[PDB]
Tab-separated table of C-alpha atoms and ligand atoms in Angstrom:
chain	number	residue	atom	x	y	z
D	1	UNK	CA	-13.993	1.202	25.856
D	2	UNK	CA	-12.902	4.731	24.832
D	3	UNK	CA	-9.235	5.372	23.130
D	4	UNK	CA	-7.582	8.293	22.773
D	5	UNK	CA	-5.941	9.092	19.221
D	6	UNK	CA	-3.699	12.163	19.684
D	7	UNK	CA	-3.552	14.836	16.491
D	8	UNK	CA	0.026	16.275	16.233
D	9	UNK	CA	2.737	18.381	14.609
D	10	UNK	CA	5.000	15.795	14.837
D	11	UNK	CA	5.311	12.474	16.536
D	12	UNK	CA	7.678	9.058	16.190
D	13	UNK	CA	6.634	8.575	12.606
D	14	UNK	CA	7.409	12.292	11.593
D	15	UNK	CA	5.772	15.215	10.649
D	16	UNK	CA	1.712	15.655	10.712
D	17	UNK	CA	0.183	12.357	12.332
D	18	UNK	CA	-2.460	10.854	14.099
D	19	UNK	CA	-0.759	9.116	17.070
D	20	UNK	CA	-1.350	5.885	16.913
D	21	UNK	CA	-2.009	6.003	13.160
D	22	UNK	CA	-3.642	2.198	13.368
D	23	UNK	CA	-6.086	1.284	16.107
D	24	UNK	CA	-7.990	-1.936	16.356
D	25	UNK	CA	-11.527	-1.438	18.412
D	26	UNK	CA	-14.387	-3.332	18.839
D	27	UNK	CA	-18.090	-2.450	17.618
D	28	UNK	CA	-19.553	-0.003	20.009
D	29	UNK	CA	-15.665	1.392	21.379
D	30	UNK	CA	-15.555	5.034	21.118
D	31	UNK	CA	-11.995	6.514	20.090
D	32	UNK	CA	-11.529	10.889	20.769
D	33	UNK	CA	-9.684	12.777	18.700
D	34	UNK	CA	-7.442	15.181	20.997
D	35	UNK	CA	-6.441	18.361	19.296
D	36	UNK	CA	-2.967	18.034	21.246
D	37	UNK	CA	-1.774	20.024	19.128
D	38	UNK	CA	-3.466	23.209	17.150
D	39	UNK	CA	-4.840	23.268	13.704
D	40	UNK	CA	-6.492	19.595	13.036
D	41	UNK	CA	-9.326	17.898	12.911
D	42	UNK	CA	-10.192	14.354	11.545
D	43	UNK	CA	-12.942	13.225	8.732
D	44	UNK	CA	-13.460	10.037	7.005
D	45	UNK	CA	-11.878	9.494	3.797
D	46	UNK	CA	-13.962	9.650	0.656
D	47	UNK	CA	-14.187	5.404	-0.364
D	48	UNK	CA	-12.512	4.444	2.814
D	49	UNK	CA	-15.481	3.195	4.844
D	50	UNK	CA	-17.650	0.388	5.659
D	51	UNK	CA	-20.944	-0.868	3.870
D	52	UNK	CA	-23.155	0.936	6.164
D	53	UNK	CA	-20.819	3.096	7.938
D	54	UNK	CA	-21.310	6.695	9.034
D	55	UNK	CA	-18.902	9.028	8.001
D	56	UNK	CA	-17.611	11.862	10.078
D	57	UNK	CA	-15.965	15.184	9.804
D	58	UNK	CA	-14.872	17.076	12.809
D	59	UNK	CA	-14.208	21.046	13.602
D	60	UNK	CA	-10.738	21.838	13.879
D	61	UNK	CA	-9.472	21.677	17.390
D	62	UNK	CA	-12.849	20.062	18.389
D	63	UNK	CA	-12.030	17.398	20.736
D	64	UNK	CA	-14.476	14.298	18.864
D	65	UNK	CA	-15.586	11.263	20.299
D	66	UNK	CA	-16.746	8.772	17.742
D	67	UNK	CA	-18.782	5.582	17.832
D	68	UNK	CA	-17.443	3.243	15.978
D	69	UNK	CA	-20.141	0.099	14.764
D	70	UNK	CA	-19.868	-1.341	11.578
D	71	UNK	CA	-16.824	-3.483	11.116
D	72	UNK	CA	-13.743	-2.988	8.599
D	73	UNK	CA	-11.294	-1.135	7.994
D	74	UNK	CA	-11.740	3.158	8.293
D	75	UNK	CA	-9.596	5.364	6.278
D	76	UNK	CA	-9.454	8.813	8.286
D	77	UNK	CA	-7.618	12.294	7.462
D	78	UNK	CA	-7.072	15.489	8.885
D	79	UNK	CA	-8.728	17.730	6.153
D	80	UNK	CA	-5.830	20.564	5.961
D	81	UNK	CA	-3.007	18.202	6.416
D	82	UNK	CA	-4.548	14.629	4.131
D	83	UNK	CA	-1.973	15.862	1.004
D	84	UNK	CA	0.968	16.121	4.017
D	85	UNK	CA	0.109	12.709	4.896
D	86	UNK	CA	-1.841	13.011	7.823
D	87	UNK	CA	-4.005	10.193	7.924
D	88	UNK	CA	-4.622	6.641	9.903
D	89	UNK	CA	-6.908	3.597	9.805
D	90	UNK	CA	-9.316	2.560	12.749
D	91	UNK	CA	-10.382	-1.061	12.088
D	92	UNK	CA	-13.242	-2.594	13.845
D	93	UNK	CA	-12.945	-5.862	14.248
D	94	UNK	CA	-11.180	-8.803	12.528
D	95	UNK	CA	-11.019	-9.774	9.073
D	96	UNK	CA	-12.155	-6.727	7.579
D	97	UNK	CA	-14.409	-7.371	4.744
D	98	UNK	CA	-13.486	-4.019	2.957
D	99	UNK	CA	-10.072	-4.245	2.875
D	100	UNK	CA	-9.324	-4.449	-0.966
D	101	UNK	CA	-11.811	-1.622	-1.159
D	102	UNK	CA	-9.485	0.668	1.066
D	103	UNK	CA	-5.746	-0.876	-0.086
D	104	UNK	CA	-7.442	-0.046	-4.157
D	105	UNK	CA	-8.431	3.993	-2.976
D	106	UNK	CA	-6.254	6.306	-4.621
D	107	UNK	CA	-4.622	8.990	-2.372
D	108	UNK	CA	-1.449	11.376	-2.609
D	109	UNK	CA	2.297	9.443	-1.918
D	110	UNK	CA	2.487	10.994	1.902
D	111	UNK	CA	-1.128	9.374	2.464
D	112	UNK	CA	-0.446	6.547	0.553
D	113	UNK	CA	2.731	5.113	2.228
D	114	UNK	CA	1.111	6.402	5.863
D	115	UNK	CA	-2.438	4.469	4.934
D	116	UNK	CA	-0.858	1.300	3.931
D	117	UNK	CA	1.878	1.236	6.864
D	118	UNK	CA	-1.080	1.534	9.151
D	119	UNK	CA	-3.138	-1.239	7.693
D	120	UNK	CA	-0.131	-3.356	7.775
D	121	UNK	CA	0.245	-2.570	11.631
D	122	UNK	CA	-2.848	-4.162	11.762
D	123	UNK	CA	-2.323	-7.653	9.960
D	124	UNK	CA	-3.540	-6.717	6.659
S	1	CU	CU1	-3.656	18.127	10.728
């Protein structure tokens, strides 16, 4: 199954987000990055991936469909915005094996508080 996540200006939770921020998928689920909105793009974050996992960096405004495999937990960013706090988490599956891996990464506060709302969303 494919999911949209939306890159915006602005959106429920405020200024500079991925909308949703947390998105639950299963192995082989693609999920495309819209540029809704002018002047993002999306890339893994550095420590915030699974054993075995791909990462990923986008062009900004490319619209980006990614195949997600390898279960856990993915930190993602928009590479101008990440200090702003634009960031999410895709998880693949349940129980993600990685999580103290991803909760331990260090990021700024607007990241931070954005990463770990999103990985609460999701159970964690
Ligand atoms: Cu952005």
């Amino acid at each position: 199954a494919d999911f949209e996540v939306h890159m915006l200006n602005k959106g429920k939770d405020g200024a500079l987000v991925f909308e949703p921020a947390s998105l639950k998928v299963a192995p082989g689920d693609t999920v495309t990055f819209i540029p809704t909105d002018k002047g993002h793009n999306v890339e893994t974050i550095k420590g915030m991936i699974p054993d075995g996992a791909e990462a990923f960096k986008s062009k900004i405004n490319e619209n980006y469909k990614v195949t997600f495999t390898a279960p856990g937990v993915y930190g993602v960013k928009c590479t101008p915005h990440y200090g702003m706090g634009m960031v999410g988490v895709v998880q693949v599956g349940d129980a993600p094996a990685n999580l103290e891996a991803v909760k331990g990464a260090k990021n700024p506060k607007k990241a931070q508080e954005r990463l770990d709302a999103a990985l609460a969303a999701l159970g964690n």
